[model samples]
Target: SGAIYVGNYRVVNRHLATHNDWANLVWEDSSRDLLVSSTTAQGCDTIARCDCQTGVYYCSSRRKHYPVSFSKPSLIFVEASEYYPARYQSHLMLAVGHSEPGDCGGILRCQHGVVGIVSTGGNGLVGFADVRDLLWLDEE
Candidate 1:
């Protein structure tokens, strides 16, 4: 599930979210431009928090990419990752619509900034991990 095809190259996952049910994509090519473009589109480098019902964008397997909204603005707890300890609570953001399992890892962005990363979804709900927190982890 961690494997993704970037162009013609199949990249393996290099990072896993122990706290949340998600992982990062591996790429040989520089991805700075993509990140810069997203941040530019958002008009913010990193968004610490967002408002409820705020519109966001993410990609789905079947639809490619689409816009959605958050059901809430606050951080939520989810224990979905089997790699982590049972009962361990992972911080996440919930979206107000249906999403497929294949949509996981889709970047979440607002018109003015990035919101999070798609993690999991079911039953008309989508889960995403905050990109701000993940960026901090990446810097170190």
Candidate 2:
């Protein structure tokens, strides 16, 4: 089940799928310091204090409400060896060839927090663009 907001953003259900991915509708205040989710787990669910300059975001998890952030940059790297087996390959640090069509733009939640988003899919694989790479916008 889903709905729409009267504010700046809008979510429309265009099609149906067997399994949907995890996502949220968020609205940011003028200061850009406060992020509020207006989705199912809506209403001040968890405030994300973000600084786009450094790609650092401090916020509590949606479920456990625990503080999380990328302190050393080590946490962002998905240890390809630990999670999925030989079918996975850490190329350009993009998660490719491990998901499906409906998985694109979905959060790649690792042990700590979201590390990336599903980018492309098909032919028995899906690619992901790291969240840090998307946020920081710096040459690595």
Candidate 3:
């Protein structure tokens, strides 16, 4: 249900909960542009396009693909599987008790009422605008 590719290159990857604290992968081409997925810092997760020329990472939600980057220096942040409503359900995420990432990204929690606009941005970091809603879904 996931993929990474550029031109004819591709990668099949995911961070199984069993990840021993770290793992990553990428596919590069002549333009040095790549279809990549990996753990990176000050980040949020989403399907994205990386620009080698601008040194920029652009991302947005798919009709049925990945989360887009946040203005707050985003990386795909996955909470530990243990805390999910259903254990190990990778895509199921919740608002965190804190904003920063940490062990299991500091414990996840489901939001209950009208939530504020995501306070997910930081200094010197310019991510994509028109990012998707916090948890919008597909028709599927």
- The residue-by-residue lDDT of candidate 3 on 26-90, one tens digit each, is 32221111123333332223322222111112122212212232222223333333322222221
Each candidate's TM vs. the true structure?
A: 0.50, 0.29, 0.21
Model 3 local distance difference test score: 0.23
> Which predicted model would earn the best TM-score?
1
Candidate 2 deviant stretches above 4 angstroms: 1-98, 134-140
In model 3, the runs with Cα more than 4 Å from the true position are: 16-69, 72-78, 82-140
Q: List the residue pairs that clash in candidate 2.
A: 97-125
Candidate 2 per-residue lDDT over residues 1-140, each given as its tens digit:
12222233222222221122214424322111112233333221111223221122111122222212222222222222222233322321222233443443343343433444343344533343333333322211
Q: Model 1 segments beyond 4 Å from truth?
A: 1-53, 72-88, 133-140
lDDT of each: 0.45, 0.29, 0.23
